Amino acid sequence: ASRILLNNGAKMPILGLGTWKSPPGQVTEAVKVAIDVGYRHIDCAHVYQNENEVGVAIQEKLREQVVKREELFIVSKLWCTYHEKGLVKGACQKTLSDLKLDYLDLYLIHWPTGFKPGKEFFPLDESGNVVPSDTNILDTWAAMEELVDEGLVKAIGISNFNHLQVEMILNKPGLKYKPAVNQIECHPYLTQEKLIQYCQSKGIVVTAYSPLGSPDRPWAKPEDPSLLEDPRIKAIAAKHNKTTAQVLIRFPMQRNLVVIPKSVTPERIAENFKVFDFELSSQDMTTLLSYNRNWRVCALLRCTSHKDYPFHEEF
Ligand SMILES: NC(=O)c1ccc[n+]([C@@H]2O[C@H](COP(=O)([O-])OP(=O)(O)OC[C@H]3O[C@@H](n4cnc5c(N)ncnc54)[C@H](OP(=O)(O)O)[C@@H]3O)[C@@H](O)[C@H]2O)c1
Ligand SMILES: O=C(O)COc1cc(Cl)ccc1C(=O)NCc1cccc([N+](=O)[O-])c1
């Protein structure tokens, strides 16, 4: 089945296209080709600074009569410098304008950490520390809830929240909307069993980001582990006559996760969608889970002193 049921009654496609690090000069074509081969979910963010170009592709294909708006599932995220309640509507409306949409299917708090408001995405002090903002998760959640009630977004959720941070929202007195989705890093080297169990048991859908290990992340070190080149995964791939990427994408799909692999390469965009024609075996699944090393692609040393840094907790 291609889509998963959210707590708002809407269905979310389990395979989406990632757009972090998709250069504006190349992402419009990525999204066109993705829509042509069947993607209907696109994962966006204001901080990715390509939403305009994403919007361009979507409008093009709507105009070509390739897809209908109702068939698309467009996700974006509120960046860290906009957590003040007075700033949230504006941030959401900027993304909508850039994407040339009148609603988002899903709007996420990108990180639980609020940062000093201003133009800079990562404001730092003279010593390199990210400057936090005087904001908190519940007040930010409240402002996300207003976006639903105004019709700008059909569903709201969170990203990079540990289970305790999720619980704070769940336990909020006066909660209007429960989070629909928690989008977290997840792959064979960071398998997230405790947080997936927590979220799924609370009826929160989990989206796996960086499912291929984000080899293009700008802070990569050469000695880091590399999923796509892992010989053991290559071997599981060869056995199914599939590529390593294809296995890495099928893996979260079989854990009842949503997965959002990124590419700007048209052949890989098509390749990455070809994962509904095979099944990983029970052995393949537990083998892949056993490769966990609690290794994160996405974790900022210069945020570790933030009150709301999410990765001090076990999960
Ligand atoms: N919520 C957040 O905090 C958060 C954080 C990180 C990521 N995410 C989202 O998750 C999406 C995916 O994560 P990611 O961008 O970190 O990385 P990823 O999807 O794990 O990997 C992307 C890298 O893999 C390469 N690639 C793609 N398909 C391939 C294939 N079939 N064979 C070989 N190489 C392939 C891409 O190359 P080319 O593009 O050059 O083809 C790119 O360098 C992001 O784009 C973003 O939308 C969300
Ligand atoms: O966040 C993403 O979606 C992908 O990561 C990006 C993307 C861009 Cl465009 C710029 C910077 C980042 C990155 O440093 N994100 C990691 C990060 C951020 C904030 C807090 C934390 N934290 O750990 O508190 C971590």
UniProtKB/Swiss-Prot annotation:
Keyword Magnesium: no
N6-acetyllysine: modified positions: K94, K221, K262
Classification via Pfam families: Aldo_ket_red
Catalytic activity: an alditol + NADP(+) = an aldose + NADPH + H(+); all-trans-retinol + NADP(+) = all-trans-retinal + NADPH + H(+); 9-cis-retinol + NADP(+) = 9-cis-retinal + NADPH + H(+); 13-cis-retinol + NADP(+) = 13-cis-retinal + NADPH + H(+)
Ligand binding (NADP(+)): 9-18, 210-272
UniProt KW keywords: Acetylation, Cytoplasm, Lipid metabolism, NADP, Oxidoreductase, Phosphoprotein
Protein name, per record: Aldo-keto reductase family 1 member B1
Species whose genome carries this gene: Homo sapiens
